[PDB]
Amino acid sequence: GPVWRKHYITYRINNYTPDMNREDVDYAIRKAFQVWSNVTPLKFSKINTGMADILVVFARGAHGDDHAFDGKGGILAHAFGPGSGIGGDAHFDEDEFWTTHSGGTNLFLTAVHEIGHSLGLGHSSDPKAVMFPTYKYVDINTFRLSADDIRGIQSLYG
Ligand SMILES: COc1ccc(S(=O)(=O)N(CCO)CC(=O)NO)cc1
Ligand SMILES: [Ca+2]
Ligand SMILES: [Ca+2]
Ligand SMILES: [Ca+2]
Numbered sequence: 169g170p171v172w173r174k175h176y177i178t179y180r181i182n183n184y185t186p187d188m189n190r191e192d193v194d195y196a197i198r199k200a201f202q203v204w205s206n207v208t209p210l211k212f213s214k215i216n217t218g219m220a221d222i223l224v225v226f227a228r229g230a231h232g233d234d235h236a237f238d239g240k241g242g243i244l245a246h247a248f249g250p251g252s253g254i255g256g257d258a259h260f261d262e263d264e265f266w267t268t269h270s271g272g273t274n275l276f277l278t279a280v281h282e283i284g285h286s287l288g289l290g291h292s293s294d295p296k297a298v299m300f301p302t303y304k305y306v307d308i309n310t311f312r313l314s315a316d317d318i319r320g321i322q323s324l325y326g
């Protein structure tokens with residue numbers, strides 16, 4: 169599967185969910201990128217204009233890729249593996265209610281998983297892994313990648 173073949177990766181926040189404070193969306197996305205840069209050689213930088221490697225989008229229903237969202241619940245987000253164009257991009261279902269806490273769907277935890285995909289990771293069968301394809305809230309203040317996540321990302325980078 170594809171990986172980014174460079175060490176400096178850019179992201180851009182296309183638009184902001186009205187569910188959250190702007191600074192909280194910025195911080196959640198920043199902290200989620202940091203989870204992955206903690207365990208690889210990668211460096212992430214937010215850019216404000218122009219083409220980013222990873223475009224972060226909030227959208228509902230049909231949104232121009234061939235992967236429609238389904239309203240509240242069900243699919244929370246999806247992302248594309250490394251590559252040109254839409255490659256790397258992470259889309260968050262605006263029909264969810266995004267939060268900084270245990271209420272609704274936690275943006276940070278969801279973004280960690282999505283950014284895993286943006287970097288080339290697939291799903292894990294281990295319930296403990298952030299890449300396990302089922303959302304279960306865990307306290308984000310003390311979140312940790314599982315050994316499975318670490319093995320997975322280190323098999324792709326570093
Ligand atoms: C913790 O992160 C997530 C992110 C999304 C989802 S999910 O949206 O519920 N999901 C699970 C399969 O239906 C689709 C997926 O894996 N997208 O990447 C579940 C957990
Ligand atoms: Ca949904
Ligand atoms: Ca892209
Ligand atoms: Ca919403």
Ligand SMILES: [Zn+2]
Binds near residue numbers: 235
């Ligand atoms: Zn999409």
Ligand SMILES: [Zn+2]
Binds near residue numbers: 281291
């Ligand atoms: Zn997934």
